[PDB]
Amino acid sequence: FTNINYYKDSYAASATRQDFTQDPKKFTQPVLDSIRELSAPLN
Amino acid sequence: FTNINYYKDSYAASATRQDFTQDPKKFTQPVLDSIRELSAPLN
Amino acid sequence: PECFTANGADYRGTQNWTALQGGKPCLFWNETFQHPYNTLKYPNGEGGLGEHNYCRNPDGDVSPWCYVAEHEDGVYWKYCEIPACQMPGNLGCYKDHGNPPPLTGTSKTSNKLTIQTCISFCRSQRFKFAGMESGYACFCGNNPDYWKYGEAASTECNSVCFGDHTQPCGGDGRIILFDTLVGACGGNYSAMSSVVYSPDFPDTYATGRVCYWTIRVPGASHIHFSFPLFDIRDSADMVELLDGYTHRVLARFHGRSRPPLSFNVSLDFVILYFFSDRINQAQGFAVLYQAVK
Amino acid sequence: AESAANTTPSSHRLETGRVPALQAAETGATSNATDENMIETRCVVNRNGVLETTINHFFSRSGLVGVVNLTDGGTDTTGYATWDIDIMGFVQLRRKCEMFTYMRFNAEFTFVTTTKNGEARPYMLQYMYVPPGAPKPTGRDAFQWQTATNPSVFVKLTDPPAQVSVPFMSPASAYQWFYDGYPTFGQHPETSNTTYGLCPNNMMGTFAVRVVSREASQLKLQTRVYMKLKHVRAWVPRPIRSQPYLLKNFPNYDSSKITNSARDRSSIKQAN
Amino acid sequence: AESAANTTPSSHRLETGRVPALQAAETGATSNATDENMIETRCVVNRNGVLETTINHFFSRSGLVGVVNLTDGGTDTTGYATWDIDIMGFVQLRRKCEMFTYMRFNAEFTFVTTTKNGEARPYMLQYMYVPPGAPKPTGRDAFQWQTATNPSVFVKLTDPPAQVSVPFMSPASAYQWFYDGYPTFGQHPETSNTTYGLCPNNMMGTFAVRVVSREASQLKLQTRVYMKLKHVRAWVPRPIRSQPYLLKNFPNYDSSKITNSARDRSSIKQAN
Amino acid sequence: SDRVAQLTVGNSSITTQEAANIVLAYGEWPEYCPDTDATAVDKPTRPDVSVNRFYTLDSKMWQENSTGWYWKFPDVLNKTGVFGQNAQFHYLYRSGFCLHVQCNASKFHQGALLVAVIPEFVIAGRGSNTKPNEAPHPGFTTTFPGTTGATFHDPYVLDSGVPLSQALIYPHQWINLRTNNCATVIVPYINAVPFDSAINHSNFGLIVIPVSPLKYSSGATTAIPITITIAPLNSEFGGLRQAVSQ
Amino acid sequence: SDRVAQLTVGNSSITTQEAANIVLAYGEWPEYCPDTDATAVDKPTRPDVSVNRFYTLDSKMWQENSTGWYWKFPDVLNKTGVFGQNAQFHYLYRSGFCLHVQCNASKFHQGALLVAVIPEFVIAGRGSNTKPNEAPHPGFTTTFPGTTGATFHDPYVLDSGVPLSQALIYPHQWINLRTNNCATVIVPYINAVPFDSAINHSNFGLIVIPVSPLKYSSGATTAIPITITIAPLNSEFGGLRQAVSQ
Amino acid sequence: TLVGQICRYYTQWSGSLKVTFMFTGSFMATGKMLVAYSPPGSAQPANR
Ligand SMILES: *[C@@H]1O[C@H](CO)[C@@H](O)[C@H](O)[C@H]1NC(C)=O
Ligand SMILES: *[C@@H]1O[C@H](CO)[C@@H](O)[C@H](O)[C@H]1NC(C)=O
Ligand SMILES: *[C@@H]1O[C@H](CO)[C@@H](O)[C@H](O)[C@H]1NC(C)=O
């Protein structure tokens, strides 16, 4: 399964397990004051 | 046995286990009143 | 010029080959009892059918075609690539590859797309060349280089249109070129010898079409006219020949009048009149002229 | 149900009210008259299997699907050879497949390439799968043959035939060879409906092949496609066609010269 | 997150104070207006996958990287063929790779060698990887081809294409295709800065190839390099280039004859 | 206790005296689209009264030289009433149907009819031309007959190349003039997509074909019509926009 | 926290920046007809999406010599969309409405508008004739203006003999160009019968009357339109029959 | 846009979109607009 490598090195293997860690708020909302969803952005 | 696949995908395997679920009354007797075996179909 | 129609319906030639370079011969039109097109059911012409094997178009197809000998490979009929079969205003077919198109301009897609709708779409925006491909396309442009991908064969670009099923709308990845001058109403014509079509020529002409074709030449002696195509079956619509110096009428053609094939006028300010009707519309005209210097 | 059916011992009846042989066919149902409610039977245990008659064992045959030519001339050559992937070209797999309305399966395409007169020289080929929306390669040295973000297979002629697994890739939930409808909107003509019955959710791109070289190769190859079905599910069984096929993507038949479903006999009162 | 997103049932609101559709864009943030704080939606559970859109599945394509010629003549021959390893030569993998600032990955170089007119004769080749600082071989029978303390691969033309795994070998922590700086010190000219933007931590040696023989071989080979990325990590995403590439190792564009990012329309008040 | 029936849907009712049992297609009742199989986001509308009732079409006289008739059900009642009005404004559609075909005669007439539904009943063109330019294709009134209906030309091959003898695999019912005078088939929503346009795609089609000819002695009645009623059970609509015609 | 608002109904949304609080007419929300107050027997239909959304009418330029405009709400959106199509097929009707009138300008313009609903807003004829044969009566486009609207002749007496000064007893709201640029009134179903025809009877009518004239200096913008949107909250329909026009 | 190029890399897309408009006029300039989306069917609407 998944074609494990037969070598002493670790970079000669295939793609390892996937990682679904998106964390998209670092690009869409890069602000300090947490803007609420139902509110005005400016008071 | 049965030639299990060596891949990450699931559609690249061979035929899986068989399934003998016929259920042939959906085509032969598609009626609402269950007609008994020893009776007249119309009264 | 031998074909004055968008599909080559009026082609009377003697080319008994499918192509002049690397082709297979065409079968005779009397040795074809197997197929529903032969002279045994269509005598006295009917598209042109005698005792020959010429590339005709009796079935209203997009291009002339003949019967090829079946070599147990399926196809029993091939399109005949006629080099001298192009209406004046048809530049030819060219190839279409990618992000740089042959015609740099506006595009339009439609579920009904004939030749004249795309020509009018490109003409209403003041473009010089029209173009369409794969049946649903309208590529306008003004660039002088539309052969940047190469010229393709005319048999390759015979995909059918969508609004009409007797016109070739190019092909998949192959654009067919047209001028925006054909099928319009009027134009300051000052060339040596051009052609004048009726409004909406590839389609039928609309109801209430009236326009003015002005013919001016820089000092020719006299002009020579000709009428290759003429098909009007109504007594209301009519073509006229006018003089613009003192506004006198030279000739009055009608649907019930058979016009001469050629005549002469010793003038250089010829005006063309065309009053349409609202009851019956069948086909336009393909007036070809020539000025004698 | 690993076997067919068993028969229980029966006997004779002499009494009124029970009529198993009078199943009315006006109800749209199938007669449920068994052997035990009829002529006196015996006790037999049946060990005949019903495994071969399943759909998965009925559609796991390869069959021929497409034939692609490759002339590769010198002055009027093309180089490439595209072939749109459709199975309605050869009436055997089509007749076997068109007895259902909705199907869903996976494919095991196999490519067998030979020469014109018959010979296997070690020329390397390149099979390319162009999905719908990707540009088609124009030329034997075109830009599209880089196969970046595009699956391709490199194999020679002397090698065994290639074999790739294709998943279920329809945008809908299942396939269908019968679409009683129209793909677009608006007004539809009455003379020639070339758009009626056009299956929208069936186009699967175009298959392409060329020869990896520099100048040319004076050879005329001819590759054949064999598609095996697997993991197949069928819905809404349809009657099997009894007329000869006439067109590629349109079910038509000859109005005159109709073929009967059975052959002719001398008389109706004669079994031979 | 193995699937995309689910929608909760929504309803209408008639009240003051809550405005979800007035997200100010002056703040540099993206509007967080969902469907449930808007037009009335239903309850749908989405099972569409997000596995294919990951970086590891987006960069695991081979693509073409380099083309190396080998003339091997008789009187003006060279014998060897060096090729500096860089991926900014073919705009497809470069355009796909230059949408990030810092990357780090491993490589799976594959070498496909053919003949000029197209033929596979059993000639043995020798592929050599010369790291930066090792001497380059000069001649088809040079001293450097001994491959002592130097990795090399011996393969024929009839064999399947070779495939070796290359690790991450940059002296820094990650790769970068954009170096806004200068490699040296001192005074820099104003007329022609041929040293600006020169990526210092990107040179990876030179790839070499010859034919193992004694006298010569009247053949013109042409090998192609296909580099597959794996174990890739990307940082600082950059916008995708919209101008045609003009130079090998310098991002330039034509000042005149600029290409717009979109095509032209007839009017602004018309969607077609 | 079984040859009588009263089908009531909405504000309509159908009474009968000579009937067989109702036929339920494929053993599945028409039900609303479950949230697992759905793919749209906008909330669908459910009138539940004005679009769920028995719409009666016209009657067709069954002569001796009759061949048969067929309809397209999401197209027949597409211009008549609240169902049609609701189907012209929306883009998505999903519903089941209840069928009822009336054909009564005396006890001296003879003949038998075959009423059945055919999912994806595509009409075949009739001709022996393989050229793409002359290959015959059916017109719009042949593919989509409307509320009137269309006749058969070769009902032996179902006008589709498929034999009529094998058409008993579909949900069918017979009208034998010595046994009953009506036939009832309930059919659920059969499609490979959850919702679909009710204008550019007919799901299935009803077909009435007299296999046994109508015969009677001189002196009896001579007008034998075929009447059909349709009930759109469990209608749903979505994608509200401007009303389109076709 | 109060001058901003986002009203979302169905697939529509209305965002604003300068708003007062919403006006709820008579303190009653639009609700469905209870079974105690109902009198019909047939089950009513409830689309709940396709007829419950913000329909935007046309805009009208507000000049200096403007007098005002008025509409009839179960008549304006009576031919446009699924609400109109559903209202032409049915005989009974019951719904509430959400209102929104847009009028923005710069901080240099001045003027004020009065938007209010008038239940049973009957138009009065203008004349001094008491004979039945010459007594002036309003036309159909004056009583039922349609989706376009009608103008006032004597907006001081509301074109009904009733003074405008006392028209503040109705559910009203002001549009003062120095304070806000929109006005919102939610109105329930007000009638003396549970259900009623949406074609032969308008329940109430919106009215926009500029009491303070529009004034600005030479150099500013001169096109000041009035835009209105309508949301039919809690629609019900009954008595399904053929579609009528008017 | 960036999402347009990302969707041009792939061949099939799903999910909802967002279009955010932004007014860059003066402070004293006011007004109202109607942004409207319409599913397929007929052509672009003629009037509001
Ligand atoms: C075509 O016609 C010409 C007569 O002009 C004749 O000489 C020639 O042999 C013909 N060729 C074929 C293939 O029929
Ligand atoms: C067809 O016409 C050609 C030209 O005259 C002739 O040679 C040939 O014999 C004809 N064929 C038949 C069957 O008459
Ligand atoms: C017109 O003039 C040309 C030469 O000027 C002559 O050849 C031709 O026959 C003339 N046409 C007629 C109809 O006289």
mmCIF file of C-alpha atoms in Angstrom, chain D:
data_model
loop_
_atom_site.group_PDB
_atom_site.id
_atom_site.type_symbol
_atom_site.label_atom_id
_atom_site.label_comp_id
_atom_site.label_asym_id
_atom_site.label_seq_id
_atom_site.Cartn_x
_atom_site.Cartn_y
_atom_site.Cartn_z
ATOM 1 C CA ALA D 1 -29.434 -16.883 -3.418
ATOM 2 C CA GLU D 2 -26.326 -18.830 -4.418
ATOM 3 C CA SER D 3 -28.367 -21.397 -6.383
ATOM 4 C CA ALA D 4 -31.445 -21.221 -8.615
ATOM 5 C CA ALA D 5 -34.489 -22.750 -6.874
ATOM 6 C CA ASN D 6 -35.700 -25.964 -5.249
ATOM 7 C CA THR D 7 -38.887 -27.916 -5.966
ATOM 8 C CA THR D 8 -41.041 -29.284 -3.143
ATOM 9 C CA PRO D 9 -43.044 -32.510 -3.615
ATOM 10 C CA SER D 10 -46.561 -31.819 -4.878
ATOM 11 C CA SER D 11 -49.755 -33.851 -5.147
ATOM 12 C CA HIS D 12 -53.188 -33.643 -6.755
ATOM 13 C CA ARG D 13 -56.124 -31.525 -5.611
ATOM 14 C CA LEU D 14 -59.845 -32.179 -6.139
ATOM 15 C CA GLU D 15 -61.734 -29.228 -4.649
ATOM 16 C CA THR D 16 -63.365 -25.926 -5.574
ATOM 17 C CA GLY D 17 -62.244 -22.336 -5.004
ATOM 18 C CA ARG D 18 -58.472 -22.524 -5.562
ATOM 19 C CA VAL D 19 -57.431 -21.597 -9.109
ATOM 20 C CA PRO D 20 -53.691 -20.897 -9.526
ATOM 21 C CA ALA D 21 -53.710 -21.133 -13.347
ATOM 22 C CA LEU D 22 -56.095 -18.216 -13.978
ATOM 23 C CA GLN D 23 -53.694 -15.260 -13.483
ATOM 24 C CA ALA D 24 -55.262 -12.243 -15.211
ATOM 25 C CA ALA D 25 -52.795 -10.400 -17.455
ATOM 26 C CA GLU D 26 -54.837 -7.176 -17.566
ATOM 27 C CA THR D 27 -53.299 -6.205 -14.205
ATOM 28 C CA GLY D 28 -49.827 -5.659 -15.669
ATOM 29 C CA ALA D 29 -48.360 -8.336 -13.387
ATOM 30 C CA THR D 30 -46.502 -11.531 -14.242
ATOM 31 C CA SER D 31 -48.220 -14.867 -13.653
ATOM 32 C CA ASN D 32 -47.053 -16.328 -10.329
ATOM 33 C CA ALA D 33 -48.092 -19.920 -11.150
ATOM 34 C CA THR D 34 -45.460 -22.324 -9.798
ATOM 35 C CA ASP D 35 -44.917 -26.038 -10.431
ATOM 36 C CA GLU D 36 -46.209 -27.187 -7.034
ATOM 37 C CA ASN D 37 -49.645 -25.635 -7.659
ATOM 38 C CA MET D 38 -49.771 -27.679 -10.895
ATOM 39 C CA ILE D 39 -48.744 -31.116 -12.233
ATOM 40 C CA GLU D 40 -47.350 -33.419 -9.542
ATOM 41 C CA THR D 41 -43.623 -32.779 -9.104
ATOM 42 C CA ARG D 42 -40.874 -34.448 -7.064
ATOM 43 C CA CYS D 43 -38.261 -33.283 -4.553
ATOM 44 C CA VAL D 44 -35.141 -32.008 -6.324
ATOM 45 C CA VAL D 45 -32.383 -29.867 -4.819
ATOM 46 C CA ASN D 46 -30.813 -27.604 -7.435
ATOM 47 C CA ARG D 47 -27.113 -26.753 -7.219
ATOM 48 C CA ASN D 48 -26.931 -24.792 -10.480
ATOM 49 C CA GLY D 49 -25.248 -21.435 -10.008
ATOM 50 C CA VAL D 50 -26.540 -17.954 -10.791
ATOM 51 C CA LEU D 51 -23.163 -16.202 -10.567
ATOM 52 C CA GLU D 52 -22.412 -15.778 -14.279
ATOM 53 C CA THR D 53 -25.683 -14.000 -15.125
ATOM 54 C CA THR D 54 -24.948 -10.948 -12.963
ATOM 55 C CA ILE D 55 -24.358 -7.468 -14.462
ATOM 56 C CA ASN D 56 -20.749 -7.348 -13.227
ATOM 57 C CA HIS D 57 -19.974 -10.618 -15.030
ATOM 58 C CA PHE D 58 -22.013 -9.562 -18.079
ATOM 59 C CA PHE D 59 -20.241 -6.238 -18.699
ATOM 60 C CA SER D 60 -16.674 -7.338 -17.881
ATOM 61 C CA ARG D 61 -15.793 -7.922 -21.532
ATOM 62 C CA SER D 62 -13.457 -5.688 -23.505
ATOM 63 C CA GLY D 63 -14.759 -5.567 -27.076
ATOM 64 C CA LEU D 64 -13.660 -3.044 -29.690
ATOM 65 C CA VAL D 65 -14.572 0.619 -29.283
ATOM 66 C CA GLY D 66 -12.596 2.729 -31.739
ATOM 67 C CA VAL D 67 -10.109 2.540 -34.596
ATOM 68 C CA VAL D 68 -7.713 5.460 -35.097
ATOM 69 C CA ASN D 69 -5.624 5.916 -38.242
ATOM 70 C CA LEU D 70 -2.261 7.684 -38.445
ATOM 71 C CA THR D 71 -0.991 8.324 -41.970
ATOM 72 C CA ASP D 72 2.123 10.419 -41.180
ATOM 73 C CA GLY D 73 2.865 11.257 -44.807
ATOM 74 C CA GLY D 74 5.522 13.498 -46.268
ATOM 75 C CA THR D 75 3.773 16.412 -47.992
ATOM 76 C CA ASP D 76 0.083 16.200 -46.982
ATOM 77 C CA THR D 77 0.720 14.720 -43.551
ATOM 78 C CA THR D 78 -1.086 15.446 -40.290
ATOM 79 C CA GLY D 79 1.146 13.897 -37.623
ATOM 80 C CA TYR D 80 -1.424 13.622 -34.844
ATOM 81 C CA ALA D 81 -4.638 11.596 -34.688
ATOM 82 C CA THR D 82 -7.488 12.739 -32.443
ATOM 83 C CA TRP D 83 -10.458 10.492 -31.676
ATOM 84 C CA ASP D 84 -13.434 11.619 -29.602
ATOM 85 C CA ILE D 85 -14.191 9.001 -26.953
ATOM 86 C CA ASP D 86 -17.607 7.449 -27.593
ATOM 87 C CA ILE D 87 -18.792 3.837 -27.576
ATOM 88 C CA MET D 88 -21.660 4.198 -30.076
ATOM 89 C CA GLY D 89 -19.513 3.322 -33.082
ATOM 90 C CA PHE D 90 -19.470 -0.525 -33.067
ATOM 91 C CA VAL D 91 -22.916 -2.132 -32.732
ATOM 92 C CA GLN D 92 -21.823 -5.053 -30.540
ATOM 93 C CA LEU D 93 -20.907 -3.222 -27.331
ATOM 94 C CA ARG D 94 -23.569 -0.630 -28.166
ATOM 95 C CA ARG D 95 -26.286 -3.281 -28.486
ATOM 96 C CA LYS D 96 -25.089 -4.871 -25.250
ATOM 97 C CA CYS D 97 -24.996 -1.484 -23.482
ATOM 98 C CA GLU D 98 -28.258 0.026 -24.790
ATOM 99 C CA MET D 99 -30.532 -2.434 -22.966
ATOM 100 C CA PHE D 100 -30.484 -0.088 -19.952
ATOM 101 C CA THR D 101 -31.307 3.589 -19.498
ATOM 102 C CA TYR D 102 -28.894 4.781 -16.782
ATOM 103 C CA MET D 103 -25.489 3.208 -16.148
ATOM 104 C CA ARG D 104 -22.434 4.006 -14.035
ATOM 105 C CA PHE D 105 -19.099 2.204 -14.220
ATOM 106 C CA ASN D 106 -15.318 2.458 -14.537
ATOM 107 C CA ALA D 107 -13.209 1.753 -17.612
ATOM 108 C CA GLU D 108 -10.020 -0.181 -18.380
ATOM 109 C CA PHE D 109 -9.058 1.121 -21.842
ATOM 110 C CA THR D 110 -6.402 -0.934 -23.643
ATOM 111 C CA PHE D 111 -4.564 0.333 -26.731
ATOM 112 C CA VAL D 112 -3.327 -2.092 -29.405
ATOM 113 C CA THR D 113 -1.301 -0.498 -32.215
ATOM 114 C CA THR D 114 -0.053 -2.303 -35.335
ATOM 115 C CA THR D 115 1.370 -1.390 -38.742
ATOM 116 C CA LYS D 116 -0.377 -1.389 -42.118
ATOM 117 C CA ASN D 117 0.921 -4.630 -43.635
ATOM 118 C CA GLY D 118 1.659 -6.045 -40.171
ATOM 119 C CA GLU D 119 4.969 -5.511 -38.370
ATOM 120 C CA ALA D 120 6.207 -4.316 -34.956
ATOM 121 C CA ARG D 121 9.178 -1.971 -35.256
ATOM 122 C CA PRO D 122 10.455 -0.314 -32.043
ATOM 123 C CA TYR D 123 8.938 3.118 -32.609
ATOM 124 C CA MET D 124 7.917 5.016 -29.480
ATOM 125 C CA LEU D 125 4.370 6.390 -29.390
ATOM 126 C CA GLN D 126 2.630 8.908 -27.141
ATOM 127 C CA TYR D 127 -1.016 8.501 -26.128
ATOM 128 C CA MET D 128 -2.625 11.680 -24.791
ATOM 129 C CA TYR D 129 -5.985 12.168 -23.063
ATOM 130 C CA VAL D 130 -7.328 15.675 -23.719
ATOM 131 C CA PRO D 131 -10.268 16.493 -21.397
ATOM 132 C CA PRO D 132 -13.085 18.739 -22.661
ATOM 133 C CA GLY D 133 -11.918 22.348 -22.521
ATOM 134 C CA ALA D 134 -8.225 21.658 -23.055
ATOM 135 C CA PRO D 135 -6.805 22.701 -26.444
ATOM 136 C CA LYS D 136 -6.355 20.029 -29.089
ATOM 137 C CA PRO D 137 -2.805 19.583 -30.445
ATOM 138 C CA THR D 138 -2.364 20.716 -34.058
ATOM 139 C CA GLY D 139 0.794 19.169 -35.483
ATOM 140 C CA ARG D 140 3.233 16.420 -34.523
ATOM 141 C CA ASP D 141 5.503 18.977 -32.795
ATOM 142 C CA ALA D 142 2.823 21.199 -31.258
ATOM 143 C CA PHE D 143 2.951 23.024 -27.924
ATOM 144 C CA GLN D 144 0.252 20.822 -26.321
ATOM 145 C CA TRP D 145 2.447 17.692 -26.321
ATOM 146 C CA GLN D 146 4.332 18.909 -23.228
ATOM 147 C CA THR D 147 1.726 17.039 -21.119
ATOM 148 C CA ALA D 148 1.978 19.432 -18.174
ATOM 149 C CA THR D 149 -1.156 18.988 -16.051
ATOM 150 C CA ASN D 150 -2.286 16.391 -18.599
ATOM 151 C CA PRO D 151 -2.097 12.574 -18.403
ATOM 152 C CA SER D 152 -0.166 10.757 -21.115
ATOM 153 C CA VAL D 153 1.370 7.333 -21.720
ATOM 154 C CA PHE D 154 4.690 6.659 -23.472
ATOM 155 C CA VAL D 155 4.974 3.153 -24.931
ATOM 156 C CA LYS D 156 6.660 1.489 -27.900
ATOM 157 C CA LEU D 157 5.228 -0.834 -30.546
ATOM 158 C CA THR D 158 7.256 -3.867 -29.430
ATOM 159 C CA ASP D 159 6.051 -3.422 -25.844
ATOM 160 C CA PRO D 160 2.878 -5.109 -24.569
ATOM 161 C CA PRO D 161 -0.289 -3.053 -25.092
ATOM 162 C CA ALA D 162 -0.852 -0.238 -22.629
ATOM 163 C CA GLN D 163 -3.747 -0.395 -20.179
ATOM 164 C CA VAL D 164 -5.009 2.499 -18.048
ATOM 165 C CA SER D 165 -7.927 2.730 -15.622
ATOM 166 C CA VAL D 166 -10.480 5.502 -16.221
ATOM 167 C CA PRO D 167 -12.877 6.489 -13.400
ATOM 168 C CA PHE D 168 -16.489 7.656 -13.544
ATOM 169 C CA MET D 169 -16.196 11.244 -14.781
ATOM 170 C CA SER D 170 -19.680 12.340 -15.759
ATOM 171 C CA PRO D 171 -20.952 15.626 -14.265
ATOM 172 C CA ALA D 172 -24.285 13.928 -13.490
ATOM 173 C CA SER D 173 -24.931 10.945 -11.212
ATOM 174 C CA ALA D 174 -24.944 8.351 -14.016
ATOM 175 C CA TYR D 175 -24.577 7.903 -17.761
ATOM 176 C CA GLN D 176 -27.496 7.786 -20.180
ATOM 177 C CA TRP D 177 -27.692 6.854 -23.864
ATOM 178 C CA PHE D 178 -31.260 8.192 -24.241
ATOM 179 C CA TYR D 179 -31.875 11.907 -23.634
ATOM 180 C CA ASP D 180 -35.420 12.823 -24.701
ATOM 181 C CA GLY D 181 -34.870 16.557 -24.736
ATOM 182 C CA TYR D 182 -32.924 19.538 -26.015
ATOM 183 C CA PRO D 183 -29.530 20.904 -24.909
ATOM 184 C CA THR D 184 -30.324 24.599 -25.501
ATOM 185 C CA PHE D 185 -33.325 26.933 -25.206
ATOM 186 C CA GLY D 186 -35.309 29.009 -27.678
ATOM 187 C CA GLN D 187 -37.182 28.041 -30.818
ATOM 188 C CA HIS D 188 -36.568 24.661 -32.425
ATOM 189 C CA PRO D 189 -37.045 24.019 -36.159
ATOM 190 C CA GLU D 190 -39.400 21.495 -37.716
ATOM 191 C CA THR D 191 -37.469 20.465 -40.845
ATOM 192 C CA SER D 192 -34.109 19.232 -39.504
ATOM 193 C CA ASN D 193 -33.650 18.797 -35.741
ATOM 194 C CA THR D 194 -29.933 18.055 -35.628
ATOM 195 C CA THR D 195 -29.944 18.932 -31.902
ATOM 196 C CA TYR D 196 -32.620 16.485 -30.702
ATOM 197 C CA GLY D 197 -31.391 13.632 -28.522
ATOM 198 C CA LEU D 198 -27.882 15.081 -28.174
ATOM 199 C CA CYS D 199 -26.629 13.570 -24.903
ATOM 200 C CA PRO D 200 -25.155 16.547 -22.997
ATOM 201 C CA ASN D 201 -23.617 14.664 -20.056
ATOM 202 C CA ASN D 202 -21.657 12.144 -22.132
ATOM 203 C CA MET D 203 -18.786 13.979 -23.870
ATOM 204 C CA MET D 204 -15.489 12.811 -22.372
ATOM 205 C CA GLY D 205 -12.839 14.725 -24.298
ATOM 206 C CA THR D 206 -10.687 13.573 -27.191
ATOM 207 C CA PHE D 207 -7.988 10.902 -27.318
ATOM 208 C CA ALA D 208 -4.794 11.807 -29.178
ATOM 209 C CA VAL D 209 -1.686 9.991 -30.403
ATOM 210 C CA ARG D 210 1.488 10.896 -32.298
ATOM 211 C CA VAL D 211 4.985 9.509 -32.910
ATOM 212 C CA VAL D 212 7.859 10.902 -30.843
ATOM 213 C CA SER D 213 10.551 11.793 -33.389
ATOM 214 C CA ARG D 214 12.132 14.811 -35.100
ATOM 215 C CA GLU D 215 11.625 14.696 -38.870
ATOM 216 C CA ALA D 216 9.038 12.056 -39.836
ATOM 217 C CA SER D 217 8.422 8.319 -40.093
ATOM 218 C CA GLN D 218 7.263 6.670 -43.322
ATOM 219 C CA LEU D 219 4.760 4.361 -41.643
ATOM 220 C CA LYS D 220 0.974 4.044 -41.423
ATOM 221 C CA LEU D 221 -0.116 2.898 -37.969
ATOM 222 C CA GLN D 222 -3.615 1.843 -36.921
ATOM 223 C CA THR D 223 -4.473 1.631 -33.216
ATOM 224 C CA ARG D 224 -7.511 -0.088 -31.708
ATOM 225 C CA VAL D 225 -9.251 0.748 -28.426
ATOM 226 C CA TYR D 226 -10.687 -1.917 -26.107
ATOM 227 C CA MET D 227 -12.773 -0.663 -23.173
ATOM 228 C CA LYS D 228 -13.625 -3.020 -20.305
ATOM 229 C CA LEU D 229 -16.423 -2.115 -17.897
ATOM 230 C CA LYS D 230 -16.155 -2.674 -14.155
ATOM 231 C CA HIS D 231 -17.977 -1.588 -10.990
ATOM 232 C CA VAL D 232 -21.080 -1.199 -13.156
ATOM 233 C CA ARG D 233 -24.608 -0.368 -11.971
ATOM 234 C CA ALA D 234 -27.624 -0.343 -14.294
ATOM 235 C CA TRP D 235 -31.092 1.191 -13.983
ATOM 236 C CA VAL D 236 -34.392 1.120 -15.884
ATOM 237 C CA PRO D 237 -33.932 -1.825 -18.287
ATOM 238 C CA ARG D 238 -34.962 -1.130 -21.890
ATOM 239 C CA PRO D 239 -35.918 -3.608 -24.633
ATOM 240 C CA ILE D 240 -33.149 -4.754 -26.952
ATOM 241 C CA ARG D 241 -33.044 -3.125 -30.383
ATOM 242 C CA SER D 242 -34.287 -5.299 -33.255
ATOM 243 C CA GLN D 243 -33.399 -2.948 -36.124
ATOM 244 C CA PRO D 244 -30.010 -2.463 -37.819
ATOM 245 C CA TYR D 245 -28.147 0.645 -36.717
ATOM 246 C CA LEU D 246 -27.818 3.375 -39.342
ATOM 247 C CA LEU D 247 -26.192 6.444 -37.746
ATOM 248 C CA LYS D 248 -23.464 7.200 -35.228
ATOM 249 C CA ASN D 249 -25.215 9.343 -32.600
ATOM 250 C CA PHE D 250 -28.868 9.034 -33.635
ATOM 251 C CA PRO D 251 -31.155 5.998 -33.300
ATOM 252 C CA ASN D 252 -32.710 5.611 -36.752
ATOM 253 C CA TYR D 253 -34.140 2.827 -38.884
ATOM 254 C CA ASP D 254 -35.402 2.348 -42.421
ATOM 255 C CA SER D 255 -39.113 3.121 -42.720
ATOM 256 C CA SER D 256 -39.433 0.841 -45.717
ATOM 257 C CA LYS D 257 -37.579 -2.493 -45.688
ATOM 258 C CA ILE D 258 -38.444 -3.300 -42.075
ATOM 259 C CA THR D 259 -36.903 -6.362 -40.427
ATOM 260 C CA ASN D 260 -39.246 -8.656 -38.526
ATOM 261 C CA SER D 261 -38.290 -9.804 -35.040
ATOM 262 C CA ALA D 262 -38.697 -13.469 -36.043
ATOM 263 C CA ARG D 263 -38.209 -15.483 -39.208
ATOM 264 C CA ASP D 264 -41.042 -16.845 -41.343
ATOM 265 C CA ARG D 265 -42.808 -20.202 -41.188
ATOM 266 C CA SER D 266 -44.796 -22.130 -43.773
ATOM 267 C CA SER D 267 -48.010 -22.212 -41.724
ATOM 268 C CA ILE D 268 -49.112 -21.235 -38.240
ATOM 269 C CA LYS D 269 -50.333 -24.797 -37.525
ATOM 270 C CA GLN D 270 -46.872 -26.363 -37.856
ATOM 271 C CA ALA D 271 -43.977 -26.289 -35.399
ATOM 272 C CA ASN D 272 -41.177 -27.101 -37.858
#
